[PDB]
Design a protein around this ligand. Structure first.
Ligand SMILES: C[C@H](O)CCCC(=O)CCC/C=C/c1cc(O)cc(O)c1
Ligand SMILES: C[C@H](O)CCCC(=O)CCC/C=C/c1cc(O)cc(O)c1
Ligand SMILES: [K+]
Ligand SMILES: [K+]
Lengths: 267, 266
């Protein structure tokens, strides 16, 4: 596996990883922007004959050398433009993309905005509603935010506490630093940017949508309704918000099978 | 509150309760068939100007005087025929109906099969898939079934353990006896009988569908997809499988507001 950095003309110095040869599959992180969450799955996916690329998101973890605009007032459309910039830098012309949460918003924006570049998109648990309890963390002190959100991740949405904790001290130290960046930059502006207001724009698109099997029905109820209205494939993965952490083998199998489905349909 | 019995010519002697005067609202129990789960909500709903009727289901609790065919190999269509029989016996000509679980299958079967009798139906968490872990309890001894399912209700699907416990010792003593009846008669036959084969049959019907907000997404994921395909109103109630137990006030408000919406549309 390649582990390196690359700078794009928008001022972001990205940390990225890449493994394998074959059609491109790109794994976009969730809002916490931490790509070591994909470590196990990257190898499993690449071994099936794909070139797999992932990266820390701007302002987060090892991609923290970035202009303030890239991690404040963040929207799906901003993130999509940034992901296109690193795909350009890495000479990735066509890609299958995965994303969860703000990453889900991002990959739908990618598919809609850059259809020539995106083979197909997998979106998971895409936030479309403002949640005051999350937005309100943005005015707390840094260490208060990190303590609160570390707790929320572990206890409310990890979908697997043992796997979450087993990410280990190095990863959780980076996440600890990311929580205030995410809190101040994402929850107030990501949900209104959700690229799902136009159901007819989604119809017929190479989009596969998932929600966590154990996720409380209310959390992404709206995803299931919207996908069904648009005739978009909608299904479940085990766990909750982080299937690539809680169930990396099942996650990898899903990404591989879904990419293979669209490679067939393309031909 | 009227608490009484009535015998229908299919051999069932029903225990039923009624309160209030006005348009009829009928509360069909879940598979456990125990109508004291509606106690709080019956009074709240009736107070808003409705005649509310509920009953224990055949073979369950105080409606246990019933032929074996009414609580074995149970289907939505059988249950709907039984509910129509007690509505006939109580001279309830037009009704709003609520049902959860097998009760949900029942009220959708009622709406489709007896459109002239049903003003509107509210269905909650309608089972459409066989679950082997539930079906398999049918072959266990009575006491093991009761122990297993009492635990499942309390800890997994009540949506509110304190409220579940607060049903009280007499209710849980009745449920204790119902669990093996439900296990042997329901899980292997209720899901395949789900009246949701034909989405076009549901389109335009006065149906309001809910799932519990805290219910794991996978449990009734299919409900949300089917309702949306059919253009049916689909939404959430607080809690999980027993909103009338866990959140009786919110439940009653929902039943009242939904009935009022359809009385206006009428
Ligand atoms: C991993 C995730 O991308 C960031 C941590 C927050 C979290 O997991 C809560 C559950 C999912 C919510 C996402 C969400 C919810 C909002 O209201 C606004 C927003 O920008 C994102
Ligand atoms: C209260 C409920 O009506 C009877 C107790 C079982 C339970 O609550 C488990 C969760 C909901 C499942 C209902 C269900 C599931 C099946 O596979 C088959 C079936 O006939 C009913
Ligand atoms: K796994
Ligand atoms: K309540």
């Amino acid at each position: 596996r390649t582990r390196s950095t690359i700078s794009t003309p928008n001022g972001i110095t990205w940390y990225y990883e890449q493994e394998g040869t074959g059609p491109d599959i790109v794994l976009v992180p969730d809002g916490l922007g931490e790509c070591q969450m994909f470590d196990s799955s990257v190898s499993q996916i690449a071994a099936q004959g794909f070139r797999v690329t992932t990266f820390d998101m701007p302002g987060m973890s090892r991609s923290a050398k970035a202009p303030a605009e890239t991690y404040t007032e963040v929207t799906a459309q901003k993130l999509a433009s940034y992901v296109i910039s690193i795909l350009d830098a890495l000479d990735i012309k066509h890609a299958t993309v995965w994303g969860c949460s703000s990453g889900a918003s991002t990959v739908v924006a990618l598919l809609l905005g850059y259809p020539d570049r995106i083979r197909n998109a997998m979106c998971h648990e895409l936030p479309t509603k403002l949640l005051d309890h999350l937005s309100n963390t943005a005015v707390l002190e840094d260490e208060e935010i990190s303590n609160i959100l570390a707790n929320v991740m572990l206890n409310d949405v990890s979908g697997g506490s043992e796997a979450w904790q087993a990410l280990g001290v190095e990863v959780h130290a980076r996440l600890h630093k990311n929580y205030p960046v995410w809190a101040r930059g994402y929850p107030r502006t990501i949900p209104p940017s959700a690229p799902v207001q136009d159901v007819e724009a989604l119809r017929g698109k190479p989009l596969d949508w998932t929600v966590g099997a154990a996720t409380p029905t209310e959390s992404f109820f709206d995803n299931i309704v919207t996908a069904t209205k648009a005739g978009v494939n909608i299904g479940l993965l085990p766990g909750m918000h982080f299937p690539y952490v809680s169930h990396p083998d099942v996650f990898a199998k899903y990404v591989v099978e879904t990419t293979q489905k669209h490679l067939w349909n393309s031909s």
